[PDB]
Amino acid sequence: FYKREMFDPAEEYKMNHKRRGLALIFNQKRFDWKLGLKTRNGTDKDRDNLERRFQELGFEVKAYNDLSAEEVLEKIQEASTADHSDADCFVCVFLSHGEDGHVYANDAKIEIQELTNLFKGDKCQSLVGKPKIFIIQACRGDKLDDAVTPM
Amino acid sequence: YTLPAGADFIMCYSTAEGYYSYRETVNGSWYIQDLCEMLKKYGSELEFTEILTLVNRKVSLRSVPNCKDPAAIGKKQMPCFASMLTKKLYFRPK
């Protein structure tokens, strides 16, 4: 047969590097008076839970509690410019309030594209073609979803 | 062989855009609770987006039982993942 399928539906990311990779967790519990945000009690249970499952899967987990926005970008840039050559991939988790397209650090808004841009191929080359996983536990607005029933 | 700079991201959101997310003060948020429960059961066995679809199903069946303000009682939460992935992702043990 002259036409080989070049996009096999079974194709998988190669997950056979030396390390699994970094998982960062940004746990935001308390906020500046200037932000006017209520304290997210229960989030440490979320953090401890994520750190456990991510360790079970092989990641190196770095959990930060209540960092400022500048410090979040500092730890993001630190991950962005690291050597991911023998990592399978990269995870980044954010536990905060948010809205629009931004989450809150301890003191200030952070657009989610600020979290993601430093890992785009043109900036973090050692991750090109590797999965980059971002998890946002945050409000994205203030609508409520109603309950409906199949008929 | 070139890729987009935007390739192979997956954005996993606890709720749909514009909408609230819900959190238990003892057990943590609905989404992370269910994500970790699915990861515990199938992290090393299933494709990551099938897990997220399971998480989607689990959070979808919950209902706000009681709320510091009662206008969210009986309300729902639908999570949503945005995939820019190009292959199947597994965390099979290594």
Binding site: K38, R40, N41, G42, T43, S96, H97, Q137, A138, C139 | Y20, S21, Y22, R23, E24, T25, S29, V64, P65, N66, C67, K68, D69, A72
Partner: peptide, 4 residues
């Protein structure tokens, strides 16, 4: 349950 809380809102966040």
């Amino acid at each position: 349950v809380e809102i966040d």
